[PDB]
Amino acid sequence: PQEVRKANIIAARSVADAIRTSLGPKGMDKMIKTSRGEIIISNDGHTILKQMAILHPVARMLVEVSAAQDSEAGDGTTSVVILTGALLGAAERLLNKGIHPTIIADSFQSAAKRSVDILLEMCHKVSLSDREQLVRAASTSLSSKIVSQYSSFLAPLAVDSVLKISDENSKNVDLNDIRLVKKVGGTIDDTEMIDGVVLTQTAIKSAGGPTRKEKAKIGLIQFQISPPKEERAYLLNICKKIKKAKCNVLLIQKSILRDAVNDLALHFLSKLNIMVVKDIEREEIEFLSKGLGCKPIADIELFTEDRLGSADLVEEIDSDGSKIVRVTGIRNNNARPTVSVVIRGANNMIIDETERSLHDALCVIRCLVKERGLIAGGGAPEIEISRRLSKEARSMEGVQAFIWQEFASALEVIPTTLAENAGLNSIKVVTELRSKHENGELNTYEEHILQPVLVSTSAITLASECVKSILRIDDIAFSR
Amino acid sequence: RLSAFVGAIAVGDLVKSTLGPKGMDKLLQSASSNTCMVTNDGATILKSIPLDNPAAKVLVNISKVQDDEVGDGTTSVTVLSAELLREAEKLIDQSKIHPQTIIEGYRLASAAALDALTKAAVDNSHDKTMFREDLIHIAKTTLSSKILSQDKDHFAELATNAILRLKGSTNLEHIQIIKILGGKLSDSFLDEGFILAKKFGNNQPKRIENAKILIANTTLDTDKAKLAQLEKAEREKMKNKIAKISKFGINTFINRQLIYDYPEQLFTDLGINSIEHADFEGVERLALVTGGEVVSTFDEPSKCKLGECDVIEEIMLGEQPFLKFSGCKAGEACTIVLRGATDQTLDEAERSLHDALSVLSQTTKETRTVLGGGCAEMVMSKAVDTEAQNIDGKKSLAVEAFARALRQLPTILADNAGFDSSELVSKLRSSIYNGISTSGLDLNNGTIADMRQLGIVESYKLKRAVVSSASEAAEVLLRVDNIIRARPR
Amino acid sequence: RLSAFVGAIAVGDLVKSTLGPKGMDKLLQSASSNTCMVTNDGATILKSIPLDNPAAKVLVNISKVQDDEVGDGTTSVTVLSAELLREAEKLIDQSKIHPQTIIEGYRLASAAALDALTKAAVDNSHDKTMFREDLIHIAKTTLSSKILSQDKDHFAELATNAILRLKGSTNLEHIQIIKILGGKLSDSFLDEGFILAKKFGNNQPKRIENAKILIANTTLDTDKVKIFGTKFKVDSTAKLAQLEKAEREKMKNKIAKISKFGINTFINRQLIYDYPEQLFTDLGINSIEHADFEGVERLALVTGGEVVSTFDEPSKCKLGECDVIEEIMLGEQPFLKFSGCKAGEACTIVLRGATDQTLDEAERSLHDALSVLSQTTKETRTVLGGGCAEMVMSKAVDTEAQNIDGKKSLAVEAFARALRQLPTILADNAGFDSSELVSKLRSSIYNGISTSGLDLNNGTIADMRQLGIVESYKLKRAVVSSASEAAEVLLRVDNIIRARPR
Amino acid sequence: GLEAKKSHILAARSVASIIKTSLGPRGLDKILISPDGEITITNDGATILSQMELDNEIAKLLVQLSKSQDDEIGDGTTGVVVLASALLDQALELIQKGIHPIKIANGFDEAAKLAISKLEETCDDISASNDELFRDFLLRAAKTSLGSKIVSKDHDRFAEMAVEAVINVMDKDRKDVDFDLIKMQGRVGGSISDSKLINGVILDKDFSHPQMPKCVLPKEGSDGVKLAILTCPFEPPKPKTKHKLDISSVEEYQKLQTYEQDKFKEMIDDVKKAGADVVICQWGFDDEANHLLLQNDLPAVRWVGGQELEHIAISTNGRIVPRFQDLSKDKLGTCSRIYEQEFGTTKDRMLIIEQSKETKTVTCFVRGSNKMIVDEAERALHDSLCVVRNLVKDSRVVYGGGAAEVTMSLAVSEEADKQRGIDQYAFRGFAQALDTIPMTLAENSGLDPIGTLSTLKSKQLKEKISNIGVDCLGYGSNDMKELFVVDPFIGKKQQILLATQLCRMILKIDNVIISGKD
């Protein structure tokens, strides 16, 4: 049965072989040829595993580890794959010594749990009340992007949006609270933070559309305005039930089957000055039902006043072909800290990479909200944990004592790979950092390089069950 | 003869690593490769994997009936059934003993194993508080080998306190399993108010007092300018049925099928809750909890029993409306709501909890328990060798081989945990041999400690079905000397 | 390890059918195909068959030591050593047991096997007639597996009464084996008269009274004392005859010194020259020729003679005597039966076979049977054999297995099953069912009341004492010992390195 | 290039893996087939490396390791190769990391001298203070090395033979022990418990006449016992190849009869001139020589080996005299008593030449019941003579058997972080290389080598740094300090020295050129 486990380790270590070359901004790119013939290149570790089209199922688990790494911490998807391959490489020599993989899996349980308590000892607790610490953390984290000049002004704007979800008492902090919407026109330095929900769609372009309303009600309506399948009388009766409830703003779900709202019904609502926003995606339905606290309405008989929302002012602002529609003045008890950020830019390639650059900035701040405190990166926490476990290995007993020594040696791949990808000598840099490690602990602080704790915390947690679930598979049989 | 032995061992070799909490998980893959899943359940692995050996399908079909009777220990039955047939190879090649004599030898050997658990069964009727701790130890053994083993320490009192609130028939229809995404597994709570996630009505009060629950099955949709006379005629015909419902004096109405707007609108002015989309499983649960009846005759009120509930409250949890009843009749039933991380974890926890509560349901009628953790198989192993004093010539090696097959379960269990199966099992027999039988195999520290202090016990009825069904299933496959397959169509 | 374990089993599987009276004979054939001989001897099969396995050569040299002490039971030692190695494959591979633990397991198991035979050993000092019957039953088990089993009922009192006539050291030099063609095997008899296969003198009287046996070693061909260093140089044939007369001239003075001893019988190791052989007749001296080293040692244990290397004086020497020397004619060859010796401790057994091939198998059969009976004089305790001995020792193995460590538990328990492998093969060679028959005995021997044992004749369970099947205590303690040490040598070798041959 | 540092390490581990299971008291034996057909069985690595014949120069370095280790010490010859194999395995992993071979060699050299200073502080003294305390620990020290041989049966009685033999050949002031002073001797037959120690040379000889006296009397208070060693027999001279002397007439026939008759007493009278009792010669004697020496109580021995004559001349202060005219009273042997003592029922009937005063050499006496038992008992006692030689030379001793390798490995890992150099990687590899010995021994005892290594490390921290016994010796429990198990310090110091220096020379060879044979 070891032939299956031995093949699973070799196939998994072969994955991280090319990942170690792409680690860091100075890393080496990897070539990937899709089955369709498209040639793509990039240094992103998560992109490599997505287009790799892995066959063997055990190696496919590394994709789920990188997916959960970005879904929570948002950074370190390349390093978590290398850390997993290090534990698998050390586990190969464990089988040659007569150690059963169950003891290997049970030893990683106490190794991962004790590593968290040790990680909290070296961590320096910070406070969310200090804005200067959050701005410099997000600004210097954008040094991996093409434009450094426009990355400085976006740091304080991203911190002020988190201050609403930054309240002391909290449980679930999700990035969906801040909706990033990109628009054509303007520059990067011009950004406005809206206090209410903002959609991606414009307003009625035909004649008669008010496009602006004060003291309006907004609610989700899943219905569709179409002739019955005399035609204007059926479309008017639908509009008469809405006029009785005094609903100023209507929302129609996007449906590719038939037309959303007929042009004859748009002219009928133009006299009543009722704004209608069509082409509503399913992703925006769950976003409006939370902040506004409204309810989806499937049919016309389900439309009532109690299921609608409240909005103080609804207007359409057009700046350089923008025509963006914003909503303010919710004034609802069910309202939550929902933040809307408008992204502006000239070229299409600008608002694309710039928006994706802001997601990584919000992930780093999200790490500090869930777990407070920060630690200077660059291999400092990896060497600190590896040295302390060397002394604790002498205090253990049994077969595990040999595993504690091999577990600490597996953490040395992180400082070694960073030294190799940067062109510096592997042995010369690693021995030099460990030399001064007897006195200095975390000393990278002057270079403003700070790695959040959740990245180092999730890297140990995800790799604990990953490596565990691998060795626990003693065979693979075809089942259909 | 070779195809039946190898075919049975190949089935046992698949689940041999899934036995015990320290066991290993088997991975499966289909042609699409996107359906691959990781589960240690023997019922999922055996049913999914196709086999070309018809003799191997007999052991799988027998395990299907055994899985529905208990739900726990199905893997141990499949392995034990393979150990009897695996040891039969030495009973033939180097022995040359008649197979039916070996079959008759298992019957005499199984009788000694049943009497061993009977003499070792110890139950305490007095001090029911101490009996609650016994159910806690049994619940920890059922949650083993499954993803719930993380929080099982907190889940021990969850399943224990739930069964103690029944006090009645062993039927499991009084317990409903609800799985909602979000939150840690330890956040699950126990509620006896019959939580229901199906919302009824458009505009209805979230709280109502002095409500009477009644079950009814009828079609309110269809019967059986010109269309206006037919639609109004159906409302007048169904109006007499609603008048009979108003004579029931009930403040709550439940229909199995859908409900038209006109009979639902009349329920609002009368203060009656209109409940729809009740499946067949919900009707059987509401009958044994709320004390309802089908009520198939509307021709006159007071032909059926009426239910009562103090408060019907609606709560919002997990981004979905829920129904929490309060102050019902015969509230002995309970509902367990588990909070998982993902849908993949929910599928493994559901069946694991359903099989765990199935064993605890039999613990109410059966108070006798035995010591687990490898100690049960060691006690029965000596009782087989004790009866070997009086035995026939050809039945001597057949009965003796049954005692060594009982020690194969802790041997494989020690191999799955990574410990030494030769050192631990051998030293365990020496202490149990003469006097003072307490300690058993421990899968944590690696030594032999007391199973009573660690809280590892097993039910008498659960362990009896393992030794019984496996001994009977092994005699069927060994008895068959020929396989005849017809032309497949 | 794969070649040593499997290679040792293949060696034991060849001689496994030669154990027991119901066993089978193994046939061997060489390249010339004319040397084929059917024999049940385990020592002949192992030594003749060449083997390239270095581990198999270890049991060959060990079997030579076991054959020198007793000469029987050598097959059971090889089979028992092979069963321990066959079960060791299951103890190593699937049982997770270190090989050194298996070696230490046999050490603790060997102590329990010796203690079982000690408590079961019962001897009777009083009523020596009952002790004579025990020697009869032991001789029946030694003569088993051989053609002599036909007349073994008559041969039972032949070997029993022969040992009782020794009364002295256990050395086998007292009993001499003589084999003459013709007559049935039942015609053999016991004779203490020291039958000799060689005659004496050219023409001399057969019956001799008041003879004095004197053992002497001298060269009678060209006998000269301190005359060496000179040759015969002659220029003619007539001159050579003058120097040849000095041979008898110096011999006449040599015979005169020997004739002063006053002996009626002379014994020499070498041949005798023509003239003194005729001169001894006139002097009454009877010279004996063709006396080997074995014949001289047998005479020193009866009359007490000496080499007598000093002929220079009749005194300072020891001489023997005998009352009557009678010469008889049997099997067309002169024989010499002595009579009237002084406390004769020597016996002579003359076996009469049909062919030379039958006599070849009877030689080692009688020699190995009398070697075991000779050791029974020092140790009178006997045990019950016939499969019952190995069954009683199996209980003592499981008795000490109650309190034992983890790694040594399965190693000692495997030794208990190996003890039952010996009667298992015995039941297969007899034609019975080893499964059912042996299992019926273990049920009775399990708790108390151990008397009866396996019977290979009627097919039922009968008492070994009533059937007359017993074994010596000294023979079984040597088998359990040597076989245990023989298995440990092969378990201590995990690798073999052979040097480059020249 | 790359293939240089690969095949050399792989071939060294394959050859050394044979003697890994043979190192210990429980170590497995081997079968060494001689080219003549004789099969030898021994667990010692010194004989294995000498028996193995191969053309690979990598494994020949391990053979030369035990060559100088046997003559200098003769104890750790089996373990010095296994210890050197551990340094090659740890160095192979360092090569893949990019570490130069000299950096690995310099790392083992600095770690070797550092481990000696830590071990030198923990040694204890035995011969100090009471001198009787030395022989107390020395008596039980030889019993440890005899547990892996058949000698372990009677080893309690056999432990007194090696102790009393070194005392007679060594002085407290000189402290000199030579293996040539102790002659190896063994005999087949009888029982092993009858083996004793003789204060002088003891051979196995048989008299030509049965009536010769088995004991030599002092003959009214003479000076010692005079023994003459000559290369020519006393008898009329005769050729040893062919004689063929033809006599033409009776004249020369009667002359040679009178001449040779008178030469009988003339050759015997030469013994009375020197006044010697026992006469040892290379060639036999005539019948008259046995009769004349019988009445004078002068025993003679024939067919004596040439090598055995040198040992007699050293102990008895004798000389080799070529002829009978060169004899004198100063060349005769000197000994107190010569007698023939019978041992059991054996017909050998050897002779015992005693001394009763302290000499510079002794001769051991060993008996056995079988051939292989004699050869095993001689080699078992040969290593015991090497242990007692190192204990008397250096009073400072340290414990062994797997306890010292664990203690010495802990001091290296602590000082590795203080160096802050490149050799720090080689320091941790050197610490793990020392941990290979207790793991290798644990594999022969049937225990987990990983669990046993962790057990020895945990018990030496919270208790004390003193050595703790190992179950590999088959005793009741650990802590050999109570069982008086002592190993020499100079033997362990030279074992870790040559093993470390050999690993350096392997890395210093980057090319191996193997040509044909002539």
A437 and A363 belong to one structural domain: no
**Is residue A133 packed enough to be buried (19+ CB in 10 Å), middle (13-18) or exposed (0-12)?**
middle
Which residue type occupies D423?
D
Report which secondary-structure segment, H or E, holds C461: strand C461-463
Chain D touched by A50 (CB under 8 Å): no
CATH number at residue B11: 1.10.560.10
Domain boundary among C344, C379, C414: C379
Tell me the two tokens of residue D324: 């009978």
Q: How far apart are CA B320 and CA B318, in angstroms?
A: 6
Q: Determine whether the interchain pair B26/A474 forms a contact, defined as Cβ–Cβ distance below 8 Å.
A: yes
Q: How far apart are the first and last CA of chain C?
A: 27
Supply A203's token pair: 């307003």
- Cβ proximity of A363 and A74 under 8 Å: yes
How far is the C-alpha of D155 from the C-alpha of C172, rounded, in Å? 35
**Same domain, yes or no, for D348 and D225?**
yes
- From the list B29, B50, B417, the residue facing A476 with the nearest CB is B29
Q: Which residues of D touch C307 (CB under 8 A)?
A: 210
* Residue D510 sits in the same domain as residue D364: no
A36 & A4 share domain = yes
Helix axes B99-119, B375-386, angle to 10 degrees: 120
Dihedral-angle region of residue B223 (phi above 0 means left; psi in -120 to 50 means alpha; beta otherwise): beta
Say whether both C274 and C423 belong to one domain: no
Query: Do both C436 and C497 map to the same domain?
Result: yes
Burial class for D24, CB neighbours closer than 10 Å (0-12, 13-18, 19+): buried
DSSP state of A297: B
Domain that holds residue B34: 1-123+367-489
| C384 and C369 inside one domain | no
If contacts are CB pairs under 8 Å, which of residues 170-189 in chain A contact chain B?
172
Which technique?
A: cryo-EM
Classified as helix, coil or strand, B41 is: coil
Note whether C497 contacts D: Cβ–Cβ < 8 A: yes
CB contact under 8 A, C406 and B425: yes
Answer yes or no: do D365 and D423 share one domain. Answer: no
Are A287 and A227 within one domain?
yes
Question: Do residues D487 and D399 lie in contact, with contact meaning Cβ atoms separated by under 8 Å?
Answer: yes
Strands D124-125 and D396-398: antiparallel
Chain C interface, mutation test: which of B9, B86, B423, B426, most C Cβ atoms within 10 Å?
B426
Q: Is D345 exposed, middle or buried (0-12, 13-18, 19+ CB in 10 A)?
A: exposed
Is the C-alpha dihedral spanning D143, D149, D152, D158 positive or negative?
negative
Same domain, residue pair A87 and A166: no
Of the candidates B169, B162, B275, B145, the residue with the CA atom closest to the CA atom of residue B216: B275
- Looking at residue C499, the DSSP 8-state letter turns out to be P
Same domain, A105 and A116: yes
* Active-site residue (options: D42, D47, D70, D77): D77
Which residue pairs from D143-148 have beta carbons closer than 8 angstroms and sit at least 24 positions apart in sequence?
Answer: D144/D25, D144/D401, D144/D473, D144/D485, D145/D75, D145/D380, D145/D383, D145/D384, D145/D387, D146/D380, D146/D384, D147/D25, D147/D473, D147/D474, D148/D24, D148/D25, D148/D26, D148/D27, D148/D43
E-only strand ranges, B46-188: 175-181
Residue type, C427: A
Closest CA to A462 of A87, A53, A32, A13: A87
Distance CA(A360)–CA(C127), nearest Å, equals 108
User: Do D255 and D214 share a structural domain?
Assistant: yes
Question: Token digits for B316?
Answer: 């919002």
Q: Which residues contact C339 (CB under 8 A, 6 or more apart)?
A: C193, C322, C323, C324, C325, C326
Q: Are residues A328 and A201 in the same domain?
A: yes
Q: Measured between beta carbons, which residues in chain D are less than 8 angstroms from residue A419?
A: none
On whether both A368 and A444 belong to a single domain, the answer is no
- Distance from C367 to chain B by nearest Cα, in Å? 37
Strand partners, A194: A340
Q: Please give the tally of structural domains in chain A.
A: 3
User: Are the beta carbons of C456 and C22 closer than 8 angstroms?
Assistant: yes
DSSP state of D481: G
Tokens 């009398």, residue located: C370
Write the single-letter amino acid at A120: L
Pairing of strands D39-41, C334-339: unpaired
The answer to whether the CB atoms of B430 and C403 lie below 8 A apart is yes
Among residues A62, A345, A384, the alpha carbon closest in space to that of A191 is found at A345
Indicate whether C24 and C78 sit together in one domain.
yes
Cβ neighbours of B280 (radius 10 Å): 7
Tell me whether D417 touches chain A (CB under 8 Å).
yes
Pairwise CB contact (< 8 Å): B50 & A103: no
Could you tell me if C240 lies within 8 Å of chain D, comparing CB atoms?
A: no
Domain limit, last residue, from B366, B397, B426: B366
- Strand partners of residue D363: D183, D198
By the CB < 8 Å criterion, does A394 face chain D? yes
| D385 and D476 inside one domain | no
Instruction: Tell me: do C410 and C471 sit in the same domain.
Output: yes
Q: What is the domain range of residue D233?
A: 200-359
Say how many residues make up chain B: 489
Residues 6+ apart with CB under 8 A from B447: none
CA-based nearest residue to A384, from A120, A144, A186: A120
Is C366 found in the same domain as C481? Answer: no
**CA gap B83, B89 in Å, rounded:** 10
Please, are residues C102 and C411 in contact by the beta-carbon 8 Å criterion?
A: yes
Our count of domains for chain C comes to 3
**Which chain C residues contact residue B392 at CB under 8 A?**
436, 439-440
A391 shares a domain with A346: no
CB A472 within 8 A of CB B418: no
Q: CA B105 from chain center: how many Å?
A: 32
CATH number at residue D372: 3.30.260.10
- Phi-psi domain of A98 (left: phi exceeds 0; alpha: psi -120 through 50; beta: other): left
Same domain? C190 vs C292: no
The string over D47-79, giving b where at least 16 C-beta atoms fall within 10 Å of a residue's C-beta and e elsewhere, is bbbebbeeeeebbebbbebbeebbeebbbbbbb
- Point out the catalytic residue in the list C18, C75, C142, C303: C75
Q: How far apart are CA A159 and CA A53, in angstroms?
A: 38
Same domain, D207 and D329: yes
Question: Does residue A77 carry a catalytic annotation?
Answer: yes
Task: Show which of C304, C334, C364 is a domain's final residue.
Answer: C334
Closest CA to D228 of D269, D273, D276, D270: D276
**CB B357, CB B172: distance < 8 Å:** yes
**Resolution, rounded to a tenth of an Å?**
4.7
Shared domain check, C462 and C414: yes
Same domain, yes or no: B449 and B426: yes
Q: Is A228 on the interface with D (CB under 8 A)?
A: no
**Strand arrangement of the beta sheet that strand D197-198 belongs to:** D182-183, D362-364, D197-198
Test D41 with C232 for CB contact under 8 angstroms: no
Residue D453, min C-alpha distance to chain A (Å)? 8
Contacts of C4 in chain D (CB under 8 A): none
Q: CB contact, 8 Å: B41 with chain A?
A: no
For residue C436, which residues of chain B lie inside 8 Å, CB to CB?
A: 97, 392-394
Q: Is C495 helix (H, G, I), strand (E, B) or coil?
A: strand
* Strand spans (E) along A75-118: none
Do A387 and A477 belong together in one domain? Answer: yes
Active site includes C187?
A: no
Q: Specify whether C75 is catalytic.
A: yes
Q: Quick one: tokens of B300?
A: 């006159």
User: What b-and-e string marks burial along C423-449, b requiring 16 or more CB atoms within 10 Å of the CB?
Assistant: bbbbbbbbebebbbbbbbbbebbbeee
Window 207-266 of B, Cβ < 8 Å to A: 261
Check if C407 contacts D (Cβ < 8 Å).
Answer: yes
How far apart are the C-alpha atoms of A4 and A8, rounded to whole Å? Answer: 6
Phi, psi (degrees; rounded to nearest 5) at D425: -65, -40
- Cβ atoms B82, B11 nearer than 8 A: yes
Residues D58 and D149 in one domain: no
H-type helices in D213-249, by residue range? none
- What the block records as the tokens of C329 is 């004619």
The bridge status of strand C452-454 relative to strand C382-383 is unpaired
**Which CATH number goes with the domain that contains D258?**
3.50.7.10
Per the CB < 8 A criterion, the answer to whether D207 and D294 are in contact is no
Query: Which residues make beta-bridge pairs with C329?
Result: C334
Contact between A214 and A374 under an 8 Å Cβ cutoff? The reply is: no
Chains that touch C (3 or more CB pairs under 8 A): B, D
CB-based contact, A434 to chain D, within 8 Å:
yes
CB D376 within 8 A of CB D149: yes
How many folded domains does chain D comprise? Answer: 3
Candidate from C231, C307, C407 with C-beta closest to D246: C231
Q: Compute the distance between CA of residue D373 and CA of residue D41 in angstroms, rounded to an integer.
A: 11
State whether C410 and B422 contact (CB < 8 Å).
yes
B26/A55 touch (CB, cutoff 8 Å), yes or no: no
Structure tokens at D325: 């005219």
Q: Which of C39, C74, C160, C265 is catalytic?
A: C74
Q: Which residues of A fall within a CB distance of 8 Å from B24?
A: 101-102, 472-474
Q: Which of left, alpha, beta for B183 (phi over 0: left; psi -120 to 50: alpha)?
A: left
Q: How far apart are CA D141 and CA D146, in angstroms?
A: 10
Spatial contact of C486 and C59, defined as CB atoms under 8 Å apart: yes
Q: How far is CA D25 from CA C100, C486, D126, in A?
A: 11, 19, 24
- Is residue D353 located within the same domain as residue D250? yes
* B349 CB-near residues (< 8 Å, 6+ apart): B146, B147, B148, B179, B185, B338, B340
**D301 near D211, Cβ under 8 Å?**
no
The residue behind tokens 């609608």 is A308
- The CATH number covering residue C158 comes to 3.30.260.10
- The reply to whether B349 and B375 lie within a common domain is no
Residue C30, CB half-sphere, CA atoms under 13 Å: how many? 10
B327 and B190 belong to one structural domain: yes
> Could you give the C-alpha distances from A190 to A74, A146, A332, A365, C363, in angstroms and in order?
26, 19, 29, 22, 121
Find, in chain D, the residue whose alpha carbon is nearest to that of A435: D420
Residues of chain A with a following break (C to N over 2.5 Å): 229, 443
Main-chain dihedrals φ then ψ at residue D289, nearest 5 degrees: -65, -30
Instruction: Verify D-A touch: 3 or more CB pairs within 8 A.
Output: yes
Q: For chains C and D, what is the number of CB pairs under 8 angstroms?
A: 83
Contact, A413 vs A84, CB < 8 A?
no
Parent domain of A473: 1-126+373-480
CATH number, domain of D459, equals 1.10.560.10
Q: How far apart are CA C477 and CA C480, in angstroms?
A: 5
| Ramachandran bin of D21, using left for φ above 0, alpha for ψ from -120 to 50, beta for the remaining angles | alpha
CA-to-CA distance for C380 and B406, rounded, in angstroms? Answer: 47
Residue D446 touches chain A, beta carbons under 8 Å? no
